[PDB]
Design a protein around this ligand. Structure first.
Ligand SMILES: Nc1ncnc2c1ncn2[C@@H]1O[C@H](COP(=O)(O)OP(=O)(O)OP(=O)(O)O)[C@@H](O)[C@H]1O
Lengths: 538, 723
């Protein structure tokens, strides 16, 4: 991202990052995916490297995303990177659409769109969870980092949490006091820092007022930190037990042998990055106090490394370790209300295919305007760049997407891909309808297409083998049935015209134009239709 | 009588308790893990419907429906020939149910009301919503006629909208199937409340009924009678315009995961002393059924617990997946069917291994005809086969050349030799042992690690069991079973400053267990076990310990004394410290004292004697054992110390140290853990027992008249016998 690099330097860093990322682990790079999905949609000059990087990753681990189980050694997608990749694909596709046509960027982004579309399963159920107040404000555009915390002081702490605070404050004084008793600070009324004597080795119930502020602050803001994200806490009964049975006596109770579950380790990780945020925010305030001297610790939490993280994360989860030692239990604050798997809208195939139909219907409106525009003086219409965006991305994107998902659109829960990969019958219906309306779009404009007519011909040709026409006749909407019959009538009139031209002269500028149009478009598409009908006995 | 418990369509036979009997080796039906016979106990489990609410169209229709449908059954009974009368006894060909609301019995009245309610309530509780097509469908009320003369004198015209005009979907048929079985389930809970139970012949006095069976197992005439009645009520429903949309058949496959015990697959292989160092060999496997089966060649180091083809030690091939298996899965070949025969040919010279299915030689994705390109000879290869749940197969090693089905057409001209071409004796079969056994903790074992801590002058000898794999990815959080090899022998005949004389004369022995801080004590169980303990479960509690109480009486029948048997005697550490501060300050200390002469198992914890105790029979093996579930890298510890006036455990274990008060931990004593991975050797010979029912007069006859005998090496310390 830095701008001081020369072109050669920017090329060398590109090769370095690509070479590392290729053999690099997807569990590693899912961390970089978060800042990728925020920068790539901007579609600036610096996005060229991320485009190919994402293309290569999504083609390297395509089975990991596609296969329901994935590789046994590698694993399967945990669906949060799937949601991120869905947002990423849709954002790139939309913003690419609004952006003006540049040939290099378009031909570099088409493989990326194809790779991400292939990686994403079309039946993917997006999680109803969305993220709040994420870390894009943490890697904000201004200064490239912002250590924003949450408003802790808003929250109030209940009475059982007060009682927690009392217990854990006693325990924190225990830890503090053994630590300096072992270090050499010993009890004594005189207060001398050099002499290693302090009166502060004395029982919590009698110690001075000083600790309650600087003991509660860690505790009370760590608790308001629960309540901002809202994680419900509970209590086990051993806690009521300690209270019932009931200068200070030094007794060493051990700390580390307690071990923690994976979700709660991630929990400690996120509350720890909250600690890093407040910590780095106050270092930043004292940095604009000093004027300068950008300290090396100001890299974000995710950029932050293991050794600098360890002394922080340990004190992060020590509070929860004592929480479920002393007899408290913390659970997840939020529960999803309902997740709808038989829903049709959540399927990626749904949104993808009807967004494609919206684009193609808009293109049909544009070709309705071009029915008089091509008759008019010039093509210069608000949609020249738009039909270019078709002619280079959308139909080739359909090509690549179908050659990635052949069997999904063919498996109607009907024996192939037993693990998964069923495409719904209504989705198949609307697939046949988009076939029909693409055929109506391509009919009698081959000369009007700028040498991309042959491209769309073979796109529809392979799409004519990805078609299935059993679903349409078992169950279909009347309009889709009428579209199929209209395509039959177009093929019928074309076949009648061919028999007629064979009727006067079969041996081989309007007639020349229509014969060239035939030999370019019709023959491959009649062959595809006829071979499909023959191989499926339709 | 025992014959009263047989299922209806099943025949009662006297069969072998175990799977394998005496027969010909190439016809030996190898059985994989079976499916759990859970459905044998018929517990009606229907869906609850009271929690949901029913829509206003249901409220104002459940009366008019109920009227039409109760008349709909009086129509069926009139068709059968029914006659109405004032009296209640239907045996007298008279019964008051045909008449209407005000003049039919009010209990049947409200019963019809509530059954209509629960019908259209379960219509929403079954996952299907229903909505009126239009208000016209309810407003229009046409009545087709039924003969009034053949109907009874009751003024109301019986026949509504007849049987026909609606249409059938397979969704509706599947709906009414389960609605009818749910009605039977409600009937079944009613008879259970009355106290009824299933019996071959119906007995009202004994509460015996043959019709208390699952829906798929009922009698056809009755199930179809209630079926036609029930969805003729559904005929009426669809007549009144209530349009329903079926829930989609929800893809949910159990994939035959549930199996007998915990075993999902059984591996069969030849004896390790038959591995071929070189040469060209032939071997066939016959598939009686089609299933998740794997046949190939295994190395002598193959582990029965690991699935075939996941490691380098196995070289297998899968049917349904069309999958050749070695250190992963890559596509090869075609899926088989029932009756298919697969012939495995191995060359040990050019390191090529091929398979033939039904006489034709398989192709992989590549052009290579052979399956596995090259490998190393190693220590040899032996035939091997894994069988999945409810799968049966036959191994034919070519003891007789003619028995091989496809050897002549393929494998003979190439010159591959049958695996048993030049053997006079039958090849011994080795298979996975279903019952887990206790064996020493291997050092290479990634999960369990045991450290022996030498006892100082001030420290008792200690054996620490810690999980080195814990704290990492792919670890298994399951309870492990631990024990010490040396047992404690109870006295043969029960008698009915430590004092040195008391220590010399006493027979009470003691050992301690330390529950390390951070380890959940409720996961840990401390106590004694016997040699019979062979139970491995994912979730263990004190309620699942197997016990029996033999009560012996006198001539008049009074039980003068009762004896309790149990393979396991332990307490639970989590309930062991009830007060607290028994774990956090210092690791929980549980002590077990055993009295050889008296036979009392007493547990001492932190200086407080726990109320639980066990009485043990004379002459009983007892092994110190700890059952723990991992929660920390450091789990628990075996202390060998002794409390005041109690003889240390080493004296009880070792007879040479019988009079040695100083605790000892000799190298012989070591920790063993329950492990599935072991091999069982099929006998070459079995007892020949013919079974047959002589007649109804005599009954089933079993007889054995030829003796068989085998040498049994008995391991003394383990109290176990091997062959
Ligand atoms: N609401 C009713 N209206 C008319 N007759 C009824 C009604 N309820 C029950 N009966 C009669 O009582 C019988 C009870 O049948 P049910 O389904 O309870 O089982 P059963 O096999 O007859 O009884 P059991 O299990 O005690 O042998 C019915 O077959 C029918 O003859």
């Amino acid at each position: 991202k830095g701008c001081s690099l020369t072109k050669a330097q920017r090329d060398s860093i590109e090769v370095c990052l690509l070479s590392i990322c290729g053999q690099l682990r997807p569990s590693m790079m899912q961390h970089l995916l978060r800042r990728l999905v925020f920068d790539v949609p901007l579609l600036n000059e610096h996005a060229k490297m991320p485009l190919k990087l994402l293309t290569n990753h999504y083609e390297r681990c395509w089975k990991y995303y596609c296969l329901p189980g994935g590789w046994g050694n590698f694993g399967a997608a945990s669906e949060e990177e799937l949601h991120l990749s869905r947002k990423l694909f849709w954002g790139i596709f939309d913003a690419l659409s609004q952006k003006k046509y540049e040939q290099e960027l378009f031909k570099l982004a088409l493989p990326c769109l194809s790779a991400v579309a292939g990686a994403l399963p079309p039946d993917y159920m997006e999680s109803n969870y969305v993220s709040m107040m994420e870390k894009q404000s943490s890697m904000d555009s201004e200064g490239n980092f912002n250590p924003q915390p949450v408003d802790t002081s808003n929250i109030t702490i209940p009475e059982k949490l007060e009682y927690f605070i009392n217990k854990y404050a006693e325990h924190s004084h225990d830890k503090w006091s053994m630590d300096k008793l072992a270090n050499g600070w010993i009890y004594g009324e005189i207060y001398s820092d050099s002499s290693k004597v302090q009166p502060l080795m004395k029982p919590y119930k009698l110690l001075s007022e000083k600790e309650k502020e600087i003991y509660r602050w860690p505790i009370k803001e760590s608790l308001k930190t629960m309540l901002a994200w809202g994680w419900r806490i509970e209590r086990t009964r051993e806690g009521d037990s300690m209270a019932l049975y009931n200068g200070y006596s030094p007794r060493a109770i051990d700390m580390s042998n307690v071990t923690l579950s994976r979700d709660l380790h991630a929990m400690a990780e996120m509350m720890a990055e909250n600690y890093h945020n407040i910590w780095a925010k106050k270092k930043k305030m004292e940095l604009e106090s000093k004027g300068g001297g950008n300290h090396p610790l100001l890299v974000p939490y995710d950029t932050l490394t293991a050794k600098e993280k360890a002394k922080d994360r340990e004190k992060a989860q020590d509070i929860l370790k004592f929480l479920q030692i002393n007899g408290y239990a913390v659970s997840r604050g939020f529960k999803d209300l309902e997740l709808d798997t038989p829903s049709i809208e959540k399927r990626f195939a749904y949104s993808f295919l009807q967004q494609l139909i919206r684009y193609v219907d808009e293109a049909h409106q544009y070709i309705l305007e071009f029915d008089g525009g091509s008759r008019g003086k010039g093509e210069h219409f608000p949609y020249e760049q738009e039909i270019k965006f078709f002619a280079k991305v959308v139909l080739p994107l359909i090509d690549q997407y179908f050659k990635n998902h052949r069997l999904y659109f063919l498996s109607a829960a009907s024996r192939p891909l037993c693990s998964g990969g069923h495409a719904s019958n209504k989705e198949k219906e609307m697939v046949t309808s988009l076939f029909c309306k693409l055929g109506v779009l391509v009919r009698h404009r081959i000369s009007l297409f700028g040498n991309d007519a042959t491209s769309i011909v073979n796109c529809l040709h392979i799409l004519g083998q990805t078609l299935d026409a059993r679903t349409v006749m078992k169950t279909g909407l009347e309009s889709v049935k009428s579209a199929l019959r209209a395509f039959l009538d177009n093929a019928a009139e074309d076949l009648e015209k061919t028999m007629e031209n064979l009727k006067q002269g079969q041996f081989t500028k309007g007639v020349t134009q229509i014969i060239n149009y035939t030999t370019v478009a019709l023959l491959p598409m009649l062959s595809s239709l006829f071979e499909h009908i023959g191989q499926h006995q339709f | 009588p025992c014959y009263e418990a047989v299922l209806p369509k099943e025949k009662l036979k006297v069969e072998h308790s175990r799977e394998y009997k005496q027969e010909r080796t190439y016809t030996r039906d190898l059985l994989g893990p079976t499916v759990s016979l859970t459905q044998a106990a018929f517990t009606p489990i229907p869906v609850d419907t009271s929690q949901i609410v029913l829509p206003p169209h249901l409220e104002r229709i459940r009366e008019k429906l109920a009227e039409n449908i109760h008349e709909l059954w009086v129509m069926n009974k009139i068709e059968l020939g029914w006659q109405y009368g004032p009296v209640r006894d239907d045996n007298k060909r008279q019964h008051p149910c045909l008449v209407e609301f005000s003049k039919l019995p009010e209990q049947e009245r409200n019963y019809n009301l509530q059954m209509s309610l629960e019908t259209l309530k379960t219509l929403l509780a079954l996952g299907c919503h229903v909505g009126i097509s239009d208000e016209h469908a309810e407003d229009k009320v046409k009545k087709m006629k039924l003969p009034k003369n053949y109907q009874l004198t009751s003024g109301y015209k019986p026949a509504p909208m007849d049987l026909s005009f609606i249409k059938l979907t397979p969704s509706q048929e599947a709906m009414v199937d389960k609605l009818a079985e749910n009605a039977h389930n409600v009937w079944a809970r009613d008879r259970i409340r009355q106290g009824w139970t299933y019996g071959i012949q119906q007995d009202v006095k004994n509460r015996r009924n043959p019709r208390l069976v699952p829906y798929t197992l009922l009698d056809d005439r009755t199930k179809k009678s209630n079926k036609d009645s029930l969805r003729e009520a559904v005929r009426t429903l669809l007549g009144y315009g209530y349009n329903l949309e079926a829930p989609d058949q929800d893809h949910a496959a159990r994939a035959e995961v549930c199996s007998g015990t915990g075993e999902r697959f059984r591996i069969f292989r030849a004896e390790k002393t038959y591995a071929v160092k070189a040469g060209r060999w032939y071997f066939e496997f016959e598939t009686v059924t089609a299933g998740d089966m794997r046949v190939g060649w295994s190395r002598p180091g193959c582990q029965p617990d690991q699935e075939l083809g996941s490691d380098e030690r196995a070289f297998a091939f899968d049917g349904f997946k069309a999958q050749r298996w070695h250190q992963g899965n890559e596509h090869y070949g075609r899926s088989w069917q029932a009756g298919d025969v697969v012939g495995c040919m191995v060359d040990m010279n050019e390191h090529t291994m091929m398979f033939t299915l039904n006489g034709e030689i398989l192709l992989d994705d590549s052009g290579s005809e052979l399956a596995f390109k090259d490998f190393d000879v190693g220590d040899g290869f032996i035939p091997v086969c894994s069988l999945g749940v409810a799968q049966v197969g036959r191994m034919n090693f070519g003891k007789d050349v003619s028995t091989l089905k496809y050897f002549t057409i393929c494998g003979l001209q190439e010159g591959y030799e049958p695996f048993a071409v030049n053997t006079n004796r039958d090849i011994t079969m080795w298979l996975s042992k279903r019952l887990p056994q206790f064996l020493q903790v291997p050092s290479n074992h990634e999960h369990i690690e045991v450290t022996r801590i030498d006892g100082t002058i001030d420290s008792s000898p200690c054996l620490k069991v810690t999980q080195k794999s814990f704290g990492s990815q792919n670890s298994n959080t399951d309870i492990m079973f631990y024990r010490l090899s040396m047992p404690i022998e109870c006295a043969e005949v029960f008698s009915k400053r430590d004092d040195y004389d008391f220590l010399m004369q006493t027979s009470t022995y003691y050992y301690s267990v330390r529950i390390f801080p951070g380890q959940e004590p409720a996961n840990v169980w401390v106590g004694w076990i016997t040699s019979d303990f062979h139970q491995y479960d994912t979730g263990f509690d004190l309620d699942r310990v197997r016990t029996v109480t033999v009560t012996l009486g006198d001539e008049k029948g009074k039980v003068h004394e009762s004896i309790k048997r149990s393979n396991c005697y332990m307490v639970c550490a989590g309930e062991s410290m009830s007060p607290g501060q028994g774990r956090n300050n210092n690791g929980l200390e549980i002590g077990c004292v055993v009295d050889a002469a008296s036979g009392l198992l007493t547990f001492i914890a932190n200086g407080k004697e726990l109320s639980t105790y066990y009485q043990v029979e004379p002459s009983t093996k007892l092994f110190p054992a700890v059952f723990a579930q991992a929660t920390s890298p450091n789990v628990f510890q075996f202390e060998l110390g002794r409390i005041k006036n109690v003889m240390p455990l080493s004296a009880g274990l070792f007879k040479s140290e019988h009079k040695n008060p100083v605790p000892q931990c000799p190298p012989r004593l070591h920790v063993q853990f329950l492990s599935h991975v072991l091999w069982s050797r099929m006998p070459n010979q079995f007892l020949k027992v013919d079974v047959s029912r002589i007649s109804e007069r005599q009954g089933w006859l079993v007889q054995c008249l030829d003796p068989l005998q085998f040498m049994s090496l008995h391991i003394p310390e383990e109290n176990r016998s091997v062959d």
